[PDB]
Structure formats: structure tokens, C-alpha cells
């Protein structure tokens, strides 16, 4: 019953400060513009210990499967090759990506009927809010 409250199909309804977060990460102009337009569908499922997050959009489709606490290699939508670790901390999924001596953290939280995603790179935060599809 791990991650029960995250499981489902979610749709992005708002994004704040995402272009600035992507600049802080190092994403180039053309990818920022096309990526920032996307309104993805995030599909979260659990099978035993394995959590899968599948995200579908006009920009990119991605899929990650993982076990909490167990590092995995991820190719992000902006083509970074990162080493990722996802843990549960006080009911928040905390996803750390490491590449080229850099780090970014993505937190996914259940708040009311929404799933709230906070992406942090150094001092820059972006918030992306999802509703049930
Ligand atoms: O979330 C995902 O799985 C993907 C697929 C669905 C759409 C989308 C949009 C933008 C970015 C994205 C872009 C730039 C940066 Cl730095 C990080 C993430 C990542 C994604």
C-alpha cells in the first residue's frame, strides 16, 4: 500500500517558474520553449516493490521504474544522462538526479485532490500542479 495515494492518471494543469528552473539546469532555448508548452499526462502505478511513472506528452514520452532507495540510470526528456534515487520521506516522493557533478531534486506530494511537483535546482524552484485525469 506503498504510494497508494499517488497511483493513478494525472494531467498537468499549471506550471510556475519552469522556464527559470530549466535555465538553471542548463537546458537550451529550443528545448525550453517546446518542453515548456507540454501538458503531460503522468501515470503512476505500483506492482510489488516496483513503482512505475510513465509521462506522456506531445514533447516527449518517458517511463521510469524503480525500487525506493535503489539508484537507477535515467535519460531525462532534455537528454541528460543522470543517476537517480527516489525515496519516500514523510509521505513525499523525493527524486534526486545526479549528473556532471550537479544535482536537482524533484518532490511529488499529494495535496487535497492534486499532485504537486516541486523541482529545485540550486536556489530556483518550479511548481507543477496535476489533477486527476
Ligand atoms: O516529466 C517527464 O517525464 C517528461 C515527459 C513529459 C513532458 C516533460 C516535459 C518537460 C520535462 C523536463 C524538461 C526539462 C528539465 Cl530540466 C526537466 C524536465 C520532462 C518531461
Swiss-Prot record:
Per its record, what are the GO molecular function terms? fatty acid binding; hormone receptor binding; long-chain fatty acid binding; long-chain fatty acid transmembrane transporter activity
**For this UniProt entry, what is the primary localization, expressed as one broad class?**
cytoplasm
Known outcome of mutating residue 24 to D: In a breast cancer sample; somatic mutation
The reply on keyword Ribosomal protein is no
A Pfam family of the record is Lipocalin
Q: Which residues carry this modification: Phosphotyrosine?
A: 21
Compartments where found: Cytoplasm; Nucleus
Q: Does the keyword Lipoprotein apply?
A: no
**Record keywords:** Acetylation, Cytoplasm, Lipid-binding, Nucleus, Phosphoprotein, Transport
- Where on this chain is Nuclear localization signal (motif)? 23-33
Which residues carry the post-translational modification N-acetylcysteine, per the record? 3
Residues annotated for a fatty acid binding in this entry? 128-130
Q: Which GO terms describe its cellular component?
A: cytoplasm; cytosol; extracellular exosome; lipid droplet; nucleus
Instruction: Report any one BP term from Gene Ontology.
Output: brown fat cell differentiation
Q: Name positions with the PTM Phosphoserine.
A: 14
- PANTHER family given in the database record: FATTY ACID BINDING PROTEIN (PTHR11955)
Q: What is the role of this chain?
A: Lipid transport protein in adipocytes. Binds both long chain fatty acids and retinoic acid. Delivers long-chain fatty acids and retinoic acid to their cognate receptors in the nucleus.
Q: How does it assemble?
A: Monomer. Homodimer. Interacts with PPARG.
Similarity annotation: Belongs to the calycin superfamily. Fatty-acid binding protein (FABP) family.
In the UniProt entry, what is the domain comment? Answer: Forms a beta-barrel structure that accommodates hydrophobic ligands in its interior.
Q: What is this protein called?
A: Fatty acid-binding protein, adipocyte
Q: Which organism is it from?
A: Homo sapiens
Amino acid at each position: 500500500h506503498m504510494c497508494d495515494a499517488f497511483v493513478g492518471t494525472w494531467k498537468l494543469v499549471s506550471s510556475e517558474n519552469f522556464d527559470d528552473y530549466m535555465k538553471e539546469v542548463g537546458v537550451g532555448f529550443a528545448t525550453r520553449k517546446v518542453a515548456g508548452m507540454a501538458k503531460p499526462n503522468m501515470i503512476i502505478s505500483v506492482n510489488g516493490d516496483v513503482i512505475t511513472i510513465k509521462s506522456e506528452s506531445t514533447f516527449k514520452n518517458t517511463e521510469i521504474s524503480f525500487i525506493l532507495g535503489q539508484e537507477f540510470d535515467e535519460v531525462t526528456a532534455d537528454d541528460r544522462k543522470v543517476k537517480s534515487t527516489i525515496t519516500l520521506d514523510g509521505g513525499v516522493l523525493v527524486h534526486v538526479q545526479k549528473w556532471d557533478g550537479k544535482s536537482t531534486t524533484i518532490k511529488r506530494k499529494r495535496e487535497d485532490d492534486k499532485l504537486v511537483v516541486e523541482c529545485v535546482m540550486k536556489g530556483v524552484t518550479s511548481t507543477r500542479v496535476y489533477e486527476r485525469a
